[PDB]
Amino acid sequence: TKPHVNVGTIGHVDHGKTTLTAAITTVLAKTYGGSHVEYDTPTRHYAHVDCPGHADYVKNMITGAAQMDGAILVVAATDGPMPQTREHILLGRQVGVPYIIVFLNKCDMVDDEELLELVEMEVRELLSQYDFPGDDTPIVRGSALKALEGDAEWEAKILELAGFLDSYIPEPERAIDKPFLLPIEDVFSISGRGTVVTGRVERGIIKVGEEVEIVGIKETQKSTCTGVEMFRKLLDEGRAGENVGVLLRGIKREEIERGQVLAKPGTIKPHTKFESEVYILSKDEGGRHTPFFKGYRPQFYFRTTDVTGTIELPEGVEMVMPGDNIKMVVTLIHPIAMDDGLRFAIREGGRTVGAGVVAKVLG
Amino acid sequence: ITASLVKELRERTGAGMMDCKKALTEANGDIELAIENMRKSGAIKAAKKAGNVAADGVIKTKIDGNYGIILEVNCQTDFVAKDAGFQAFADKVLDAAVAGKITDVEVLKAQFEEERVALVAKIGENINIRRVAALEGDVLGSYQHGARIGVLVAAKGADEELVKHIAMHVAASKPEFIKPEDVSAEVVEKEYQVQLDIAMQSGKPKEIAEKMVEGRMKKFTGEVSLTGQPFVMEPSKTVGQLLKEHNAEVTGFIRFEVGEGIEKVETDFAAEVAAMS
Numbered sequence: 001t002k003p004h005v006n007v008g009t010i011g012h013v014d015h016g017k018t019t020l021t022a023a024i025t026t027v028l029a030k031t032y033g034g035s036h037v038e039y040d041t042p043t044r045h046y047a048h049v050d051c052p053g054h055a056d057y058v059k060n061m062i063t064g065a066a067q068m069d070g071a072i073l074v075v076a077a078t079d080g081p082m083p084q085t086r087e088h089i090l091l092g093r094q095v096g097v098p099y100i101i102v103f104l105n106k107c108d109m110v111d112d113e114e115l116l117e118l119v120e121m122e123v124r125e126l127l128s129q130y131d132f133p134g135d136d137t138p139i140v141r142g143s144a145l146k147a148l149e150g151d152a153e154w155e156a157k158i159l160e161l162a163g164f165l166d167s168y169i170p171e172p173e174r175a176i177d178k179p180f181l182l183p184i185e186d187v188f189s190i191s192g193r194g195t196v197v198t199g200r201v202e203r204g205i206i207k208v209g210e211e212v213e214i215v216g217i218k219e220t221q222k223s224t225c226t227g228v229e230m231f232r233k234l235l236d237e238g239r240a241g242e243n244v245g246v247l248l249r250g251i252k253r254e255e256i257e258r259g260q261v262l263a264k265p266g267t268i269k270p271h272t273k274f275e276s277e278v279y280i281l282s283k284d285e286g287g288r289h290t291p292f293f294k295g296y297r298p299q300f301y302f303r304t305t306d307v308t309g310t311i312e313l314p315e316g317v318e319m320v321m322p323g324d325n326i327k328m329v330v331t332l333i334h335p336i337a338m339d340d341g342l343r344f345a346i347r348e349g350g351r352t353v354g355a356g357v358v359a360k361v362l363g
Numbered sequence: 364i365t366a367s368l369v370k371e372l373r374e375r376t377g378a379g380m381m382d383c384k385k386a387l388t389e390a391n392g393d394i395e396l397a398i399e400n401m402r403k404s405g406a407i408k409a410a411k412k413a414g415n416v417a418a419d420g421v422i423k424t425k426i427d428g429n430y431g432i433i434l435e436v437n438c439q440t441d442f443v444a445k446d447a448g449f450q451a452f453a454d455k456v457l458d459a460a461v462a463g464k465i466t467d468v469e470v471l472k473a474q475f476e477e478e479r480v481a482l483v484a485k486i487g488e489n490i491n492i493r494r495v496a497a498l499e500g501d502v503l504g505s506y507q508h509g510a511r512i513g514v515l516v517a518a519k520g521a522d523e524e525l526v527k528h529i530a531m532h533v534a535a536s537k538p539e540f541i542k543p544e545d546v547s548a549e550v551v552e553k554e555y556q557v558q559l560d561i562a563m564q565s566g567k568p569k570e571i572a573e574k575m576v577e578g579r580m581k582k583f584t585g586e587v588s589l590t591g592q593p594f595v596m597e598p599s600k601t602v603g604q605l606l607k608e609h610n611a612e613v614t615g616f617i618r619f620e621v622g623e624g625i626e627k628v629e630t631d632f633a634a635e636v637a638a639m640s
């Protein structure tokens with residue numbers, strides 16, 4: 001099964017994002033066969049969305065929609081970068097898109113070679129001003145429309161773009177290849193055997209005899225996996241996506257808690273304070289009816305459990321309404337296993353009123 | 364006509380690369396004339412954009428003593444609404460509205476039309492000075508909920524913090540009257556007949572329905588009026604109770620929200636791509 005890559009187009013409303021995406025699908029189908037669009041290259045499967053709005057993209061990046069593995073910045077060669085091109089790239093840095101490829105569109109309408117270089121140079125500099133590697137950035141000179149109409153010379157440029165998607169965007173890491181992690185849901189003691197914790201393996205593989213750390217809420221503890229089982233049948237290993245029970249040596253069941261995480265040693269740490277991008281559900285989405293303020297004291301649901309936290313609103317912000325998305329610094333009342341990019345729900349009285357993503361761990 | 368000269372004209376105007384070369388070429392290298400020519404060309408570029416729905420943008424507020432202005436300037440995307448050039452334009456319009464006490468949006472539009480056009484020509488989105496309103500009062504305060512909602516509140520006997528809290532309340536709760544007694548008898552009469560009709564068809568006996576609707580009228584006028592609404596920061600009291608507590612009074616308020624009364628265009632990316640395929 002070929003690797004899945006999430007990409008998106010971003011750029012001016014008239015510079016050809018939709019035409020490009022149509023050209024990509026058409027040319028790739030014509031060559032390789034086969035709300036989002038999907039297309040295939042020989043080695044990869046792509047899922048492609050558009051990013052027409054800033055807040056709209058952030059909200060979807062929070063409420064579940066896949067985060068881009070890479071973005072295609074579409075700039076018409078006739079105009080060059082617009083003033084709002086800064087905002088397009090700034091979104092990229094904000095949501096931490098790791099790679100940006102540039103498609104210079106409408107090159108079928110610009111003769112002067114020296115002007116194309118001025119456009120390219122401006123783009124590379126804008127990119128670099130927001131700490132993307134402008135000098136190393138792939139910049140394809142094409143024509144989406146002419147390619148879409150079947151002009152072979154420009155169809156080649158669509159293929160050139162696909163080539164950079166294949167080579168310049170690193171193969172996304174499969175969950176089973178990441179370091180082992182299992183969110184603990186329940187804990188049982190089995191007299192004669194020992195302690196078993198249950199959960200769904202979030203990533204990696206846990207095998208009998210391997211050491212694990214128990215991370216979050218309490219002091220980190222170490223143990224060894226003395227068995228993995230599913231439906232009362234002993235496995236040799238538990239893999240990412242499987243619901244298993246992991247038998248531990250030495251640990252008593254009073255020493256493990258729901259909300260803790262089993263993990264490959266040294267690979268994840270507990271924290272209490274972080275920066276996040278947060279989205280608050282509107283009333284129609286089943287959220288709060290009323291706004292909240294600086295003393296709001298909700299629960300942050302990480303994987304399997306609530307952790308109460310206090311919040312710091314950005315300067316200049318004293319109120320948060322239902323339907324808003326904002327940045328906030330959160331301080332949990334006790335630590336939880338976390339790293340950048342970890343998603344969470346915001347709850348009150350056990351009811352979800354929002355969602356967020358950890359953007360930067362602080363303490 | 365060289366790449367350096369084209370680069371200079373683009374550096375001065377922010378106009379598209381090809382528009383710059385075309386303008387410089389017709390001007391035979393004169394930067395100042397190229398600029399003047401783009402004014403002519405720009406008006407038609409703006410005209411082509413004028414049909415585009417501009418439902419994004421900013422609300423801005425500015426207070427000058429006993430006089431305050433609230434302003435809506437629209438664009439097509441929030442990417443442009445965050446842009447420094449768009450921001451400076453909206454700020455400039457805001458400043459002029461305050462300094463000249465300009466409440467007729469057509470006067471405001473007329474003063475800035477050439478600047479608007481120059482801006483549309485470089486940004487490539489429909490931009491529109493949509494509406495403006497003034498509020499006058501003894502004490503004025505404002506609240507901006509991001510760039511999306513703006514509120515002015517006029518008050519009497521109220522300090523800065525109180526005025527601000529009420530403006531925040533107005534931003535969230537959207538009253539359209541100051542007090543329940545401000546709702547006209549005609550409005551209340553119509554609403555009474557609405558509720559009585561609803562109550563009747565639901566099978567409630569006439570004598571019971573009439574008594575229930577009487578209760579709903581007190582609810583109705585309390586809900587659309589500022590002093591009758593529960594205070595968003597402390598909903599166990601109404602804003603009216605809050606004002607009595609501070610020996611204060613609200614004499615006026617205005618709430619703008621970006622895109623109010625503009626039909627949101629529902630876009631389907633996948634479909635629009637499929638169509639082109």
Ligand SMILES: Nc1nc2c(ncn2[C@@H]2O[C@H](COP(=O)(O)OP(=O)(O)NP(=O)(O)O)[C@@H](O)[C@H]2O)c(=O)[nH]1
Nearest residue numbers: 013014015016017018019105106109143144145146
């Ligand atoms: N010459 C040329 N024109 C192009 C190219 N790509 C797009 N265009 C033109 O520029 C415009 C881009 O349209 P696009 O933004 O993709 O779709 P859209 O959002 O529906 N545009 P609109 O709504 O304004 O028609 C279209 O008028 C299209 O014909 C290109 O590579 N070369």
